[PDB]
Amino acid sequence: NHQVSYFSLQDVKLLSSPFLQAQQTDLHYILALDPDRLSAPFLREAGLTPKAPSYTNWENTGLDGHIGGHYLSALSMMYAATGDTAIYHRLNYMLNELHRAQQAVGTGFIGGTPGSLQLWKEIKAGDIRAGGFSLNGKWVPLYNIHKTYAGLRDAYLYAHSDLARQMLIDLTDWMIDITSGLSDNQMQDMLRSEHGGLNETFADVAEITGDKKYLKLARRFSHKVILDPLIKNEDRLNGMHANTQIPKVIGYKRVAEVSKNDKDWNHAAEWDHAARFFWNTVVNHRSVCIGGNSVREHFHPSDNFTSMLNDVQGPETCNTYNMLRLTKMLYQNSGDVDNSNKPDPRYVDYYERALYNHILSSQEPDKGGFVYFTPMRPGHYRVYSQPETSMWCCVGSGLENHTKYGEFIYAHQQDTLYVNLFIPSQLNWKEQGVTLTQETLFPDDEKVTLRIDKAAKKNLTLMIRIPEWAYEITINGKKHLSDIQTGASTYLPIRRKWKKGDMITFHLPMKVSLEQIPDKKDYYAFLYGPIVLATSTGTENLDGIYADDSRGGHIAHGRQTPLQEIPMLIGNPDSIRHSLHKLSGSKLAFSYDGNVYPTQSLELIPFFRLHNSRYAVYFRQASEEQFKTIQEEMATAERKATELANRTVDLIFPGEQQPESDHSIQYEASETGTHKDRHFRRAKGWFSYNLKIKEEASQLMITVRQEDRNKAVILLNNEKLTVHPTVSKADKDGFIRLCYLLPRKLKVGSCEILFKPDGTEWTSAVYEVRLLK
Ligand SMILES: *[C@H]1[C@H](O)[C@H](O)[C@@H](O)[C@@H]1CO
Ligand SMILES: [Zn+2]
């Protein structure tokens, strides 16, 4: 009787704000893409003639088709949000091209993976050769086809396309046939390969059709090794690839939702709970101040953020896009699950933190371009995509992000409206005969006004979110005072027979806070209200800040600044917090007026506004007592680590999917794993990469474990490396570096590196491959 609903994008008009800017910039980027290049893989796999070459980058190195899927979703949501005619022409054309591809094969299959029909013939026969990122020699093909399922779902739900609906059902029936001869054990083996959110999309088809066969399919596509610990409130996520898991959990939640009234299956509450526990553990233990998670795409231990503070590959944007999708699902029925009948605004505090500080920051606001990694290492920078060069996962999610800022501003519950986000907007609440405008300069000002533009004098309750970070309201010039009931996130209820012209005004008091890195190392970020602040540390060596189509072009490969050159805050955390002063002006800006080492007064602005520069979000802190020892470590060990990084020509992390894929991983009889938080690969046959040599290289460094008795032969362009390596002292965790001084410098270009056993059963387990000048 008390279900909470969301509004359609059609019903929520963004008014001038950073969000409308971001929407419009993404519109331009979406329209820049050539649909004939995005459709080319699909036509190819159907036996038709493409009209143009595919894009390059990931669209011709094995993930061919994935951006086309995202492109359907982004066009559909952007069309719902704007009604843009150019967007509709592109969406109609892409749907009709993919429909031609589907009809040419006639089975329901649509896809771009090279050799798609052969792949799925093998799978259907039970020839399943799964790795974490591969299936039968192909790059995450389940993940790829997921973006088509999702794209066709979105064309139906957002753009009302019946053609998309039929294409989606045919493609789902095709998968029923592919999996009809597979045991649950074979399915769970195949699901070891990254598969995006297929369980979610199959549950979506169940709801669209009302046919439970699609819910049985969704459950078959639910990865049990991940689900089962979550049911039991066990976080087993250390070392896992993070964006692989989040869509699975979204899927468990969606299966639970669509299964709410399924008399033949009794697990909905358990699967809902698994998702709510997953959210809790990631948000509360694995997330930084901007709302993101992971380092080099993987979950590190929650008690050790060292790599988050040292690596240039900070949180990945996809992961936050997916955590926000989950957040929206969990919030909707939070009141049903806790039998309060009011949803839990703690979900909204997270949503706001991640939306303003990560999603909004992840697009260059003027020109466009999407961020993959956001370093938390002080003094680095982030790289942006370009429309015709960049075909990354974070481009696909990037296209979607800025279409849909209207989706979570408000929620409705019969005669109740939840005012969740303080984003300028006009709402059509047709269910209660109301049109309302939210006017605010937030976060640059504290005042919010809600204006009733149209109403039918129903008694309605406005539930205004009072964030934990933030009671007098004004109605029509009259002050109404209410008692604070909790310092926690809560709602302030205001019920009236609203009429045209009524005005509700409230203020959100904003304070400076200082948020420590979660493992309580000596690094802190400044916030103002929910806004993460940052300082610009310079504009030198921003190499590849607008990416080309190269493998690895999503990473900020420019020079690493030694930490002793970046401002370090001297003193205790309360003194440091008190030393940040707000500057006068209509935009947020702050001066840091305490002691900084080395001296440059620092200016801080919102991180979402900091572009085309190096930055610090987290600052290293030093007590006056520990300064001498801290500075000596920064001047010696940290400086030397930075020098090694700055002599590095190429770098591979064996066992990490994207580093391996960017270096054209090949293998025979190989396995991967983790030891002491580091990934490896080893083989009984062999494994190989291509090294990309931008500058001549002199030295190869291989990281292994001292205790490993297995040895590798190394071939460079099929010539055995016979020079004797120098061997480093073992570190704390038992890792050593083998340093080979190459007999001849390696030429600029590409060089195969191949590892095969040297008399032993396996190669050494290799944890890092580094090429140096
Ligand atoms: C980016 C994102 O993490 C996706 O899940 C993955 O397939 C891609 C590269 O690893
Ligand atoms: Zn990504």
mmCIF file of C-alpha atoms in Angstrom, residues 25 41 346 381 630 641:
data_model
loop_
_atom_site.group_PDB
_atom_site.id
_atom_site.type_symbol
_atom_site.label_atom_id
_atom_site.label_comp_id
_atom_site.label_asym_id
_atom_site.label_seq_id
_atom_site.Cartn_x
_atom_site.Cartn_y
_atom_site.Cartn_z
ATOM 1 C CA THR A 25 28.344 17.984 -23.031
ATOM 2 C CA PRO A 41 30.848 -5.611 -35.770
ATOM 3 C CA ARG A 346 21.471 7.006 4.208
ATOM 4 C CA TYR A 381 46.193 13.743 -13.037
ATOM 5 C CA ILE A 630 58.381 11.355 7.729
ATOM 6 C CA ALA A 641 60.198 4.536 -5.879
#
